[PDB]
Coordinates of C-alpha atoms in Angstrom, one line a residue:
Chain A
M1 CA -30.9 32.3 -6.0
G2 CA -30.4 30.9 -9.4
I3 CA -29.9 27.2 -8.3
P4 CA -33.3 25.5 -7.6
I5 CA -32.2 22.1 -6.4
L6 CA -35.1 19.9 -6.4
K7 CA -35.7 16.5 -4.8
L8 CA -38.1 13.9 -5.8
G9 CA -38.8 10.6 -5.6
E10 CA -35.4 8.6 -5.3
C11 CA -33.7 11.5 -7.7
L12 CA -32.7 14.7 -7.8
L13 CA -34.0 17.6 -10.4
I14 CA -32.4 20.9 -11.4
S15 CA -33.2 23.6 -13.9
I16 CA -30.7 25.9 -15.2
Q17 CA -31.8 29.8 -15.9
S18 CA -28.7 32.3 -15.6
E19 CA -26.8 31.5 -18.6
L20 CA -24.0 33.8 -16.8
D21 CA -20.6 32.9 -17.9
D22 CA -18.4 32.8 -14.7
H23 CA -20.0 33.7 -11.1
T24 CA -23.1 31.4 -12.0
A25 CA -21.0 28.6 -13.5
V26 CA -18.9 28.3 -10.2
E27 CA -21.8 29.0 -7.8
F28 CA -23.7 26.5 -9.6
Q29 CA -20.8 23.8 -9.1
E30 CA -20.3 24.2 -5.8
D31 CA -24.2 24.4 -5.0
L32 CA -24.7 20.9 -6.8
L33 CA -21.8 19.4 -5.6
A34 CA -22.9 20.3 -2.0
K35 CA -26.2 19.1 -2.3
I36 CA -25.6 15.5 -3.8
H37 CA -23.2 15.5 -1.0
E38 CA -25.4 16.2 1.4
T39 CA -28.7 14.4 0.2
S40 CA -27.8 10.8 -1.6
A41 CA -29.7 10.4 -4.3
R42 CA -28.8 8.1 -7.1
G43 CA -30.3 9.8 -10.2
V44 CA -29.6 13.9 -11.1
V45 CA -31.1 15.5 -13.5
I46 CA -29.9 19.0 -15.0
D47 CA -31.8 20.9 -17.8
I48 CA -30.4 23.1 -19.9
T49 CA -33.9 24.2 -21.7
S50 CA -33.3 28.1 -21.2
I51 CA -30.0 28.5 -22.5
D52 CA -29.4 29.0 -26.2
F53 CA -25.5 30.1 -26.1
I54 CA -22.7 28.8 -24.3
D55 CA -18.9 29.4 -24.6
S56 CA -15.9 27.4 -23.8
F57 CA -15.7 27.9 -20.3
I58 CA -19.6 26.7 -19.4
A59 CA -19.1 23.6 -21.7
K60 CA -16.0 22.7 -19.5
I61 CA -17.7 23.3 -16.5
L62 CA -20.9 21.1 -17.8
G63 CA -18.4 18.2 -18.7
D64 CA -16.9 18.8 -15.1
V65 CA -19.8 18.6 -13.5
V66 CA -20.7 15.2 -15.4
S67 CA -17.7 13.8 -14.3
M68 CA -18.4 15.2 -11.1
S69 CA -21.9 13.8 -10.1
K70 CA -21.0 10.6 -12.0
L71 CA -18.3 9.7 -9.5
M72 CA -21.2 9.4 -6.7
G73 CA -24.6 8.4 -9.1
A74 CA -26.1 8.2 -12.4
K75 CA -27.1 11.0 -14.1
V76 CA -29.1 12.4 -17.2
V77 CA -29.0 15.6 -19.0
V78 CA -32.4 15.1 -19.8
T79 CA -33.1 18.6 -21.8
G80 CA -32.0 18.7 -25.3
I81 CA -28.6 20.7 -25.6
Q82 CA -29.6 23.3 -28.1
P83 CA -28.3 23.0 -31.7
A84 CA -26.0 25.6 -31.5
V85 CA -24.8 24.9 -28.0
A86 CA -24.6 21.2 -28.9
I87 CA -22.1 22.1 -31.7
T88 CA -20.4 24.2 -29.2
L89 CA -20.0 21.6 -26.7
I90 CA -19.0 19.0 -29.5
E91 CA -16.5 21.3 -31.5
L92 CA -14.9 22.1 -27.3
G93 CA -16.1 19.5 -24.9
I94 CA -15.6 16.7 -26.6
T95 CA -17.6 13.4 -24.9
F96 CA -20.3 11.6 -24.6
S97 CA -21.9 13.4 -21.0
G98 CA -23.3 10.4 -19.7
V99 CA -27.2 9.1 -20.1
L100 CA -29.2 11.7 -22.1
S101 CA -32.6 12.2 -22.6
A102 CA -33.9 14.8 -25.4
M103 CA -36.0 17.7 -24.0
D104 CA -38.4 15.5 -22.6
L105 CA -38.0 15.6 -18.7
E106 CA -40.9 13.3 -18.4
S107 CA -38.9 10.7 -20.4
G108 CA -35.5 11.3 -19.0
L109 CA -37.3 10.9 -15.3
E110 CA -39.1 7.8 -16.6
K111 CA -35.6 6.6 -17.8
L112 CA -33.9 7.3 -14.4
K113 CA -36.9 5.5 -12.7
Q114 CA -36.3 2.5 -14.6
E115 CA -32.9 2.5 -14.8
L116 CA -33.3 2.8 -10.7
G117 CA -35.8 0.1 -10.1
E118 CA -33.9 -2.5 -12.0
Chain B
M1 CA 40.3 18.7 39.4
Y2 CA 36.8 18.3 41.2
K3 CA 37.4 18.5 44.5
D4 CA 38.3 22.7 44.7
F5 CA 35.9 23.2 42.1
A6 CA 33.0 22.0 44.4
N7 CA 34.8 23.8 47.3
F8 CA 33.7 26.8 45.0
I9 CA 30.4 25.4 43.7
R10 CA 30.2 25.3 47.6
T11 CA 29.6 29.5 47.3
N12 CA 28.6 29.3 43.6
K13 CA 25.6 27.5 44.7
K14 CA 24.5 30.7 46.2
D15 CA 25.5 32.8 43.5
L16 CA 23.2 30.5 41.3
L17 CA 20.4 30.8 43.3
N18 CA 20.8 34.9 42.8
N19 CA 20.9 34.2 39.0
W20 CA 17.5 32.2 39.6
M21 CA 15.9 34.8 41.4
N22 CA 17.1 37.3 38.6
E23 CA 16.1 35.3 35.9
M24 CA 12.7 34.3 37.0
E25 CA 11.5 37.6 36.5
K26 CA 12.3 37.6 32.6
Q27 CA 10.6 34.5 31.5
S28 CA 7.1 32.9 32.6
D29 CA 7.3 34.4 36.1
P30 CA 3.2 33.5 36.8
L31 CA 3.5 29.7 35.2
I32 CA 7.2 29.5 37.2
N33 CA 5.7 30.4 40.4
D34 CA 2.7 28.3 39.9
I35 CA 4.1 25.3 38.9
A36 CA 6.9 25.1 41.8
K37 CA 7.9 26.9 44.7
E38 CA 10.8 28.6 45.1
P39 CA 12.6 26.7 47.3
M40 CA 12.0 23.6 45.8
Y41 CA 13.3 24.8 42.7
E42 CA 16.3 26.4 44.5
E43 CA 17.4 23.3 46.4
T44 CA 16.6 21.1 43.1
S45 CA 19.4 23.3 41.1
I46 CA 22.0 23.3 44.2
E47 CA 21.5 19.5 44.3
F48 CA 21.8 19.4 40.4
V49 CA 25.0 22.0 40.6
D50 CA 26.7 20.7 43.6
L51 CA 27.4 16.8 43.5
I52 CA 28.5 16.9 39.7
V53 CA 31.7 17.5 40.4
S54 CA 32.1 15.0 43.6
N55 CA 33.7 12.3 41.9
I56 CA 37.5 11.6 41.3
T57 CA 37.9 14.1 38.2
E58 CA 36.8 11.6 35.8
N59 CA 32.9 10.7 35.7
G60 CA 30.2 9.5 38.3
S61 CA 27.3 7.4 37.0
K62 CA 25.2 7.9 39.8
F63 CA 25.1 11.5 38.5
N64 CA 25.0 10.6 35.2
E65 CA 21.2 9.1 36.2
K66 CA 20.3 11.8 38.3
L67 CA 21.4 14.0 35.5
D68 CA 19.2 12.2 33.1
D69 CA 16.0 12.1 35.9
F70 CA 16.7 16.1 35.7
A71 CA 16.7 16.4 32.1
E72 CA 13.2 14.4 32.3
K73 CA 11.9 16.3 35.1
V74 CA 12.7 20.0 33.3
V75 CA 11.3 18.6 29.7
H76 CA 7.9 17.6 31.7
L77 CA 8.0 20.7 34.2
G78 CA 8.1 22.8 30.7
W79 CA 11.7 24.0 30.6
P80 CA 12.7 23.1 26.3
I81 CA 16.2 23.8 25.0
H82 CA 15.5 27.2 24.6
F83 CA 14.9 27.7 28.7
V84 CA 17.9 25.6 29.7
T85 CA 20.1 27.8 27.2
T86 CA 18.4 31.1 28.9
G87 CA 19.6 29.8 32.3
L88 CA 23.0 28.7 30.7
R89 CA 23.6 32.1 29.5
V90 CA 22.5 33.8 33.2
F91 CA 24.7 31.2 34.5
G92 CA 27.7 32.4 32.8
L93 CA 26.4 36.0 33.3
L94 CA 26.2 35.6 37.4
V95 CA 29.3 32.8 37.4
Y96 CA 31.3 36.1 35.5
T97 CA 29.7 38.9 38.2
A98 CA 30.8 35.9 41.4
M99 CA 34.4 36.1 39.8
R100 CA 34.8 39.7 39.7
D101 CA 33.4 39.5 43.3
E102 CA 34.4 36.7 45.2
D103 CA 38.0 36.5 43.2
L104 CA 38.6 32.9 45.0
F105 CA 39.8 30.6 41.8
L106 CA 40.9 27.0 41.6
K107 CA 45.1 26.7 42.2
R108 CA 46.6 28.8 45.3
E109 CA 48.5 32.0 43.6
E110 CA 48.9 35.3 44.9
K111 CA 47.4 36.5 41.2
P112 CA 46.0 33.4 39.4
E113 CA 45.8 33.2 35.5
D114 CA 43.4 32.5 32.7
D115 CA 43.7 28.7 33.4
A116 CA 41.4 27.9 36.0
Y117 CA 39.3 31.5 34.7
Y118 CA 38.4 29.5 31.3
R119 CA 38.5 25.9 32.9
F120 CA 35.3 27.3 34.8
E121 CA 33.7 27.6 31.5
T122 CA 34.9 24.5 29.9
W123 CA 33.3 22.6 32.9
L124 CA 30.1 24.4 32.5
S125 CA 29.8 23.9 28.8
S126 CA 30.7 20.1 29.6
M127 CA 27.6 20.1 32.3
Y128 CA 25.7 21.5 29.5
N129 CA 26.7 18.9 26.7
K130 CA 25.4 16.1 29.3
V131 CA 22.3 18.1 29.8
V132 CA 21.3 18.3 26.4
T133 CA 22.3 15.1 25.7
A134 CA 20.1 13.7 28.5
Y135 CA 17.0 15.9 27.1
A136 CA 16.7 14.6 23.7
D137 CA 16.3 10.9 24.1
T138 CA 12.8 10.4 25.4
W139 CA 11.8 13.0 23.2
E140 CA 13.4 10.8 20.2
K141 CA 11.9 7.7 21.4
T142 CA 8.6 8.9 21.8
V143 CA 8.5 10.4 18.3
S144 CA 9.9 7.2 17.0
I145 CA 6.7 5.3 18.4
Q146 CA 4.6 7.8 17.5
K147 CA 5.5 7.6 13.8
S148 CA 5.5 3.9 14.2
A149 CA 2.0 4.0 15.5
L150 CA 1.1 6.1 12.7
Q151 CA 2.9 4.0 10.4
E152 CA 1.0 0.9 11.1
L153 CA -2.8 2.4 11.9
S154 CA -3.0 4.5 8.3
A155 CA -3.6 1.1 6.1
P156 CA -6.1 -1.0 8.2
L157 CA -7.2 -4.1 6.1
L158 CA -8.2 -6.0 8.9
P159 CA -11.9 -5.3 8.5
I160 CA -13.1 -8.1 6.0
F161 CA -16.5 -9.8 5.0
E162 CA -16.7 -13.0 3.1
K163 CA -14.9 -12.3 -0.4
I164 CA -14.9 -8.8 0.5
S165 CA -11.9 -6.7 1.9
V166 CA -13.1 -3.1 3.3
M167 CA -10.1 -1.0 3.3
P168 CA -11.1 2.4 5.6
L169 CA -8.7 5.4 5.3
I170 CA -9.4 8.2 7.1
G171 CA -5.8 10.3 7.3
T172 CA -4.5 13.0 5.4
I173 CA -2.8 11.2 2.8
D174 CA 0.8 12.7 2.0
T175 CA 3.4 11.2 -0.6
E176 CA 4.3 8.6 2.5
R177 CA 1.1 7.7 3.4
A178 CA 0.0 7.2 0.0
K179 CA 2.9 4.8 -0.8
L180 CA 2.1 3.0 2.6
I181 CA -1.7 2.4 1.5
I182 CA -0.6 1.1 -2.0
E183 CA 1.7 -1.2 -0.4
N184 CA -0.3 -2.5 2.3
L185 CA -3.3 -2.8 0.2
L186 CA -1.4 -5.2 -2.8
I187 CA -0.3 -7.2 0.2
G188 CA -3.4 -7.7 2.3
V189 CA -5.3 -8.6 -1.2
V190 CA -2.3 -11.0 -2.1
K191 CA -2.6 -12.4 1.6
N192 CA -6.5 -12.6 2.0
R193 CA -8.1 -14.0 -1.3
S194 CA -10.7 -11.3 -2.0
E195 CA -12.8 -10.1 -5.2
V196 CA -14.1 -6.7 -4.2
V197 CA -12.1 -3.9 -2.3
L198 CA -14.0 -1.0 -0.9
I199 CA -11.5 2.1 -0.7
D200 CA -12.9 4.3 1.8
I201 CA -12.0 7.9 1.1
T202 CA -15.0 9.6 3.3
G203 CA -12.7 11.3 6.0
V204 CA -9.5 12.8 4.3
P205 CA -9.2 16.3 4.3
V206 CA -7.3 17.3 1.4
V207 CA -6.0 15.0 -1.6
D208 CA -3.3 17.0 -3.7
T209 CA -2.4 15.7 -7.6
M210 CA 0.1 12.9 -6.9
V211 CA -1.7 11.2 -4.1
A212 CA -5.1 11.0 -6.1
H213 CA -2.8 9.8 -9.0
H214 CA -1.3 7.0 -6.7
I215 CA -5.4 6.1 -5.5
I216 CA -6.3 5.8 -9.0
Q217 CA -3.4 3.4 -9.9
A218 CA -4.1 1.4 -6.6
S219 CA -7.5 1.2 -7.9
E220 CA -5.8 0.0 -11.4
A221 CA -3.9 -2.3 -9.8
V222 CA -6.2 -4.0 -7.8
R223 CA -8.1 -4.5 -10.6
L224 CA -5.3 -5.9 -12.6
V225 CA -4.9 -8.5 -9.8
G226 CA -8.2 -9.8 -10.4
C227 CA -10.3 -7.8 -7.8
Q228 CA -13.1 -5.0 -8.5
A229 CA -11.8 -2.0 -6.6
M230 CA -14.6 0.2 -5.9
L231 CA -13.7 3.6 -4.6
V232 CA -16.5 4.4 -2.3
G233 CA -17.5 7.5 -0.6
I234 CA -15.8 10.1 -2.3
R235 CA -15.8 13.9 -1.0
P236 CA -16.3 16.6 -3.6
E237 CA -12.7 18.3 -3.2
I238 CA -11.5 14.8 -3.6
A239 CA -13.4 14.8 -6.9
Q240 CA -12.4 18.7 -7.7
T241 CA -8.8 17.2 -7.8
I242 CA -9.2 13.4 -9.4
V243 CA -10.7 15.1 -12.5
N244 CA -8.2 17.7 -12.5
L245 CA -5.8 15.6 -13.2
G246 CA -7.0 14.7 -16.1
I247 CA -7.0 11.1 -16.0
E248 CA -9.4 8.8 -17.7
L249 CA -12.3 8.6 -14.9
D250 CA -14.3 5.7 -16.1
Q251 CA -12.5 2.1 -15.4
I252 CA -13.5 3.0 -11.4
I253 CA -17.0 2.6 -10.2
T254 CA -17.7 4.8 -7.3
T255 CA -20.2 4.8 -4.6
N256 CA -21.8 7.1 -2.2
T257 CA -21.5 5.6 0.9
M258 CA -21.0 2.0 2.3
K259 CA -24.0 1.4 3.1
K260 CA -25.4 0.8 -0.9
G261 CA -21.7 -0.1 -2.2
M262 CA -21.8 -3.3 0.1
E263 CA -24.9 -4.3 -1.4
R264 CA -23.5 -3.2 -5.1
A265 CA -20.6 -5.4 -3.9
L266 CA -22.6 -8.5 -2.9
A267 CA -24.6 -7.9 -6.2
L268 CA -21.5 -8.6 -8.0
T269 CA -21.3 -11.7 -6.1
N270 CA -24.7 -12.8 -7.5
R271 CA -25.5 -15.3 -5.3
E272 CA -23.8 -14.0 -2.0
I273 CA -26.5 -11.5 -1.6
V274 CA -28.4 -13.8 0.8
Chain C
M1 CA 13.3 -26.7 -21.4
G2 CA 11.5 -24.2 -19.6
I3 CA 8.2 -23.6 -21.4
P4 CA 5.6 -26.6 -20.5
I5 CA 2.9 -26.3 -23.0
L6 CA -0.1 -28.5 -20.9
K7 CA -3.5 -29.4 -23.0
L8 CA -6.6 -30.4 -21.6
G9 CA -10.4 -30.0 -21.9
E10 CA -9.9 -28.2 -24.9
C11 CA -8.1 -25.4 -23.4
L12 CA -4.4 -24.8 -22.7
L13 CA -2.4 -24.2 -19.8
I14 CA 1.7 -22.7 -19.4
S15 CA 3.5 -21.6 -16.7
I16 CA 6.8 -19.7 -16.1
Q17 CA 9.7 -20.9 -13.9
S18 CA 12.5 -19.0 -15.6
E19 CA 12.4 -15.5 -14.1
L20 CA 15.3 -14.0 -17.0
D21 CA 14.6 -11.7 -19.6
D22 CA 15.8 -12.5 -22.6
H23 CA 15.8 -16.0 -24.0
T24 CA 12.6 -16.3 -21.9
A25 CA 10.6 -13.6 -23.6
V26 CA 11.6 -14.7 -27.1
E27 CA 11.5 -18.7 -26.7
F28 CA 8.5 -18.1 -24.8
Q29 CA 6.5 -16.1 -27.6
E30 CA 7.4 -18.4 -30.4
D31 CA 6.7 -21.3 -28.5
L32 CA 3.3 -20.3 -27.2
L33 CA 2.3 -18.8 -30.5
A34 CA 3.7 -22.0 -32.4
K35 CA 1.4 -24.3 -30.1
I36 CA -2.0 -22.2 -30.1
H37 CA -1.5 -22.1 -34.0
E38 CA -0.7 -25.9 -34.0
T39 CA -3.3 -26.9 -31.2
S40 CA -6.6 -25.2 -31.6
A41 CA -7.6 -24.1 -28.3
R42 CA -10.0 -21.4 -27.3
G43 CA -8.7 -20.9 -24.3
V44 CA -5.0 -20.2 -23.3
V45 CA -4.1 -19.9 -19.7
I46 CA -0.6 -18.4 -18.5
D47 CA 1.4 -18.4 -15.3
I48 CA 3.2 -15.5 -13.5
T49 CA 3.6 -16.5 -10.0
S50 CA 6.7 -17.4 -10.1
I51 CA 7.9 -14.2 -11.7
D52 CA 9.3 -11.5 -8.9
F53 CA 10.6 -8.8 -11.3
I54 CA 9.6 -7.6 -14.5
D55 CA 11.1 -4.8 -16.3
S56 CA 9.6 -3.2 -19.6
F57 CA 11.1 -5.8 -21.9
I58 CA 9.2 -9.0 -20.4
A59 CA 6.0 -6.4 -19.9
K60 CA 5.9 -5.7 -23.4
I61 CA 6.6 -9.4 -24.6
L62 CA 3.5 -10.3 -22.6
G63 CA 1.0 -7.8 -23.8
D64 CA 1.9 -8.6 -27.5
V65 CA 1.5 -12.5 -26.5
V66 CA -1.9 -11.6 -25.1
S67 CA -2.8 -9.3 -27.7
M68 CA -1.6 -12.0 -30.6
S69 CA -3.4 -15.2 -28.4
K70 CA -6.9 -12.7 -28.0
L71 CA -6.1 -12.9 -32.2
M72 CA -6.5 -16.4 -32.1
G73 CA -8.7 -17.1 -29.0
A74 CA -9.7 -16.3 -25.7
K75 CA -6.7 -14.8 -23.1
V76 CA -6.4 -14.9 -19.5
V77 CA -3.6 -13.9 -17.4
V78 CA -5.0 -16.6 -14.5
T79 CA -2.3 -15.6 -11.6
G80 CA -2.3 -12.0 -10.4
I81 CA 0.8 -10.1 -11.1
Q82 CA 2.6 -9.5 -8.0
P83 CA 2.8 -6.2 -6.5
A84 CA 6.5 -5.9 -7.1
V85 CA 5.6 -6.3 -10.4
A86 CA 2.1 -5.3 -11.1
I87 CA 3.6 -1.4 -10.4
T88 CA 6.2 -1.8 -12.8
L89 CA 3.3 -3.3 -15.5
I90 CA 0.5 -0.8 -14.8
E91 CA 3.5 1.9 -15.1
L92 CA 4.7 1.0 -18.3
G93 CA 2.7 -1.7 -20.0
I94 CA -0.3 0.5 -19.7
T95 CA -3.1 -2.4 -20.7
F96 CA -5.9 -4.6 -19.4
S97 CA -4.0 -7.9 -20.5
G98 CA -7.3 -10.1 -21.1
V99 CA -9.4 -11.4 -17.9
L100 CA -7.6 -12.1 -14.6
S101 CA -8.1 -14.5 -11.7
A102 CA -7.0 -13.0 -8.7
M103 CA -4.1 -15.4 -8.3
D104 CA -6.0 -18.5 -8.5
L105 CA -5.6 -20.8 -11.4
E106 CA -8.3 -23.0 -10.4
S107 CA -10.6 -19.9 -10.7
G108 CA -9.3 -19.2 -14.3
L109 CA -9.9 -22.4 -15.5
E110 CA -13.6 -22.3 -13.9
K111 CA -13.8 -19.1 -15.9
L112 CA -12.9 -20.3 -19.2
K113 CA -15.1 -23.1 -18.7
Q114 CA -17.9 -21.1 -17.7
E115 CA -17.2 -18.5 -20.6
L116 CA -16.6 -21.4 -23.3
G117 CA -19.6 -23.3 -22.4
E118 CA -21.8 -20.3 -23.5
Chain D
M1 CA 13.0 -24.9 -11.8
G2 CA 12.0 -27.0 -14.5
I3 CA 9.5 -28.8 -12.7
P4 CA 6.1 -26.3 -12.7
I5 CA 3.6 -28.3 -10.2
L6 CA 0.3 -26.6 -11.2
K7 CA -2.9 -27.2 -8.9
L8 CA -6.5 -26.9 -10.1
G9 CA -9.5 -27.9 -8.4
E10 CA -7.7 -29.4 -5.7
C11 CA -5.8 -32.0 -7.6
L12 CA -2.3 -31.4 -8.9
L13 CA 0.0 -31.3 -12.4
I14 CA 3.4 -32.2 -13.0
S15 CA 5.3 -31.4 -16.4
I16 CA 8.8 -33.0 -16.7
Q17 CA 10.8 -31.9 -19.8
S18 CA 14.3 -32.9 -19.7
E19 CA 15.9 -36.3 -18.4
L20 CA 18.8 -36.4 -16.0
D21 CA 20.7 -38.4 -13.4
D22 CA 21.5 -38.1 -10.1
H23 CA 20.2 -34.5 -9.8
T24 CA 16.6 -34.2 -11.5
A25 CA 15.4 -37.4 -10.1
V26 CA 16.1 -36.9 -6.9
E27 CA 15.0 -33.3 -6.7
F28 CA 11.6 -34.2 -8.8
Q29 CA 11.1 -36.8 -6.2
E30 CA 11.9 -34.2 -3.1
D31 CA 9.6 -31.4 -4.8
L32 CA 6.7 -33.1 -5.5
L33 CA 6.1 -35.2 -2.1
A34 CA 7.0 -31.4 -0.5
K35 CA 4.4 -29.6 -2.6
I36 CA 1.8 -32.9 -2.3
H37 CA 2.4 -32.6 1.5
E38 CA 2.1 -29.0 1.9
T39 CA -1.1 -28.4 -0.2
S40 CA -3.5 -31.6 0.5
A41 CA -4.5 -32.8 -3.1
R42 CA -6.2 -36.2 -3.3
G43 CA -5.0 -36.4 -7.0
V44 CA -2.0 -36.2 -8.2
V45 CA -1.1 -36.4 -12.0
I46 CA 2.7 -36.7 -13.6
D47 CA 3.8 -36.3 -17.1
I48 CA 6.3 -37.9 -19.1
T49 CA 5.3 -37.0 -22.7
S50 CA 8.5 -34.8 -23.1
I51 CA 11.1 -37.6 -21.9
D52 CA 12.4 -40.3 -24.7
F53 CA 15.0 -42.3 -22.7
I54 CA 15.2 -43.8 -19.5
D55 CA 17.5 -46.2 -17.6
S56 CA 17.0 -48.5 -14.6
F57 CA 18.0 -45.7 -12.3
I58 CA 15.3 -43.1 -13.0
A59 CA 12.7 -46.0 -13.9
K60 CA 13.0 -47.3 -10.4
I61 CA 13.2 -43.5 -9.5
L62 CA 9.5 -43.0 -10.8
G63 CA 8.2 -46.2 -9.4
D64 CA 9.5 -45.2 -6.2
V65 CA 7.2 -41.9 -6.6
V66 CA 4.4 -43.7 -7.4
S67 CA 4.1 -45.7 -4.4
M68 CA 5.2 -42.4 -2.6
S69 CA 2.4 -40.7 -3.6
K70 CA 0.0 -43.8 -3.4
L71 CA 1.1 -44.0 0.3
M72 CA -1.1 -40.4 0.6
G73 CA -3.0 -40.1 -2.6
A74 CA -4.1 -41.7 -5.5
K75 CA -2.2 -41.0 -8.6
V76 CA -2.0 -41.4 -12.4
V77 CA 1.1 -41.9 -15.2
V78 CA -1.2 -40.0 -17.5
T79 CA 1.2 -39.4 -20.3
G80 CA 2.0 -41.6 -23.1
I81 CA 4.9 -43.7 -22.0
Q82 CA 6.7 -44.1 -25.4
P83 CA 7.5 -47.5 -27.1
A84 CA 11.3 -47.3 -25.9
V85 CA 11.0 -45.9 -22.5
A86 CA 7.8 -48.2 -22.1
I87 CA 10.0 -51.2 -23.1
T88 CA 12.6 -50.3 -20.6
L89 CA 10.3 -49.4 -17.7
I90 CA 8.4 -52.9 -18.3
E91 CA 11.7 -54.7 -18.1
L92 CA 13.5 -53.1 -15.5
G93 CA 11.2 -51.6 -13.1
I94 CA 8.4 -54.1 -12.9
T95 CA 5.6 -52.3 -11.8
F96 CA 1.8 -51.8 -12.7
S97 CA 2.5 -47.8 -12.0
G98 CA -1.3 -47.4 -10.4
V99 CA -4.1 -46.1 -12.5
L100 CA -2.8 -45.0 -15.9
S101 CA -4.2 -43.3 -18.9
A102 CA -1.0 -42.9 -21.2
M103 CA -2.7 -41.4 -24.0
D104 CA -2.9 -37.4 -23.3
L105 CA -3.7 -35.3 -20.2
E106 CA -7.1 -34.6 -20.7
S107 CA -7.9 -38.1 -20.6
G108 CA -6.5 -39.0 -17.3
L109 CA -7.7 -36.1 -15.9
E110 CA -10.9 -36.7 -16.8
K111 CA -10.5 -40.3 -15.4
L112 CA -9.4 -39.0 -12.4
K113 CA -12.2 -36.4 -12.1
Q114 CA -14.8 -39.4 -12.4
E115 CA -13.2 -41.5 -9.8
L116 CA -12.9 -38.8 -7.4
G117 CA -16.0 -37.2 -7.9
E118 CA -17.8 -40.2 -6.6

């Protein structure tokens, strides 16, 4: 309902619009894992534009997703994690969070395309 | 003594036939009726109970072999230790009833005593001990051979390509299987020189914490020998467990499926792609 | 006695044939360090094939020797640490220990030759 | 236990560190022959640098080993035979000892490489 999994090219695209804490987090986890296991796409792309407030649980779950689908293919968190949520992610979810693309989904798609082409 | 005991078994056989017709009702009536007819089961029982004491008070090898055959026949027929125990219980019941009715013991006396009265039960227990001794031999042998087969089948490293040693594991890996996997993988990579070892995780239903830890340690050990370990085809539940272990997860290079794992391994061996 | 320093091709080869803990550790570390300082060799190559038993002592001694050699030049454990001792090394001496050569000494010479040719 | 036979480029290397009579010579010849037989090497390299005293018996053993290996493969006494041991080897064990470098292991290794590559 809130997890619009899109497949385009040799990639995978996701947009996040729920910002709920537990239920949406776990359902997104399970849906993303099931989709990436079902269809084999080397690069998966995640959007965090809509979100402006994240607690510890979502940050940990997002880092968990990064590790999750990094165990089967490269990825980019294309959308620039907003300043408040970026700070919260740093202070709690201490990691590099994979490859990033800073708010330009065209830039993230281009980066993933050039990484897969080579 | 076994001679007069057989002379009384000549009627204890009919007593046991009454026992069989009394016991057949309580347990698995349709199954027992369908698998074997009543007269054949009765004649098998009288053969089993009549020639046991036909030897001279010591033992018999031919009837020992016949008892082993009876044990395997009743194992295949669907009479486990519980059914034979119920049979022994009803044997004792009908022997007691016949003792109350027939009242013809071994030693000739106007009023015999507890000696033969309990020697009957001792001989019954001896026969049951022999039966249970013959019961478990085939089961233990087949358990051993199945254990050996599962021990050998868990870690097939034989699938081998040029400079590549693909290792598929598909069963549910427990402690013993994890130790077997690591041992066989290390010994095989020692014996057969390689550069990339593909561990096919696709197939395992559940991996707990320690099995995942030992798999990651297997990957690290293979790296330490000097061969890249490509953990290929991991499934999201196993990813759940592996990351929840909390260990570092950057040294392992994973892959969606062997289709592209093979070509990436060939990419590592730059000129081997052709 | 039991520390055969060999010099060839502006490199250094060393071999272990003692399989004991104390004197092997101390004499090995001091002799290898003394030679690698005395003769300037970019790449030193070590041998572990003969070893079939390793405790924490020899494991940490090998780790320190590799660290010091890296502090003076390229280092490699050319022969694969045997499984019975690979497990012991990975449980306690958790280190990458330079580069490896899959139990092939000639492979390690080729690797160091190509790494020093650049 | 004190003879680290090494393999590189389908060649063979030897290292001798201590001199002894009636044990080291015989064990050394047996081990070298067993090794060169099990693994086929068309060039084997022997070392003497460490030793500084040879009597008639060791000199004859080395001469016999040189002819022995020459019966199935080219060999070299690569290491500088010191003046005292050189004089004794001339004086009692009169043999040209095959192709020899007797400067350092690198020179003889290069000579064998250039003589076997052709």
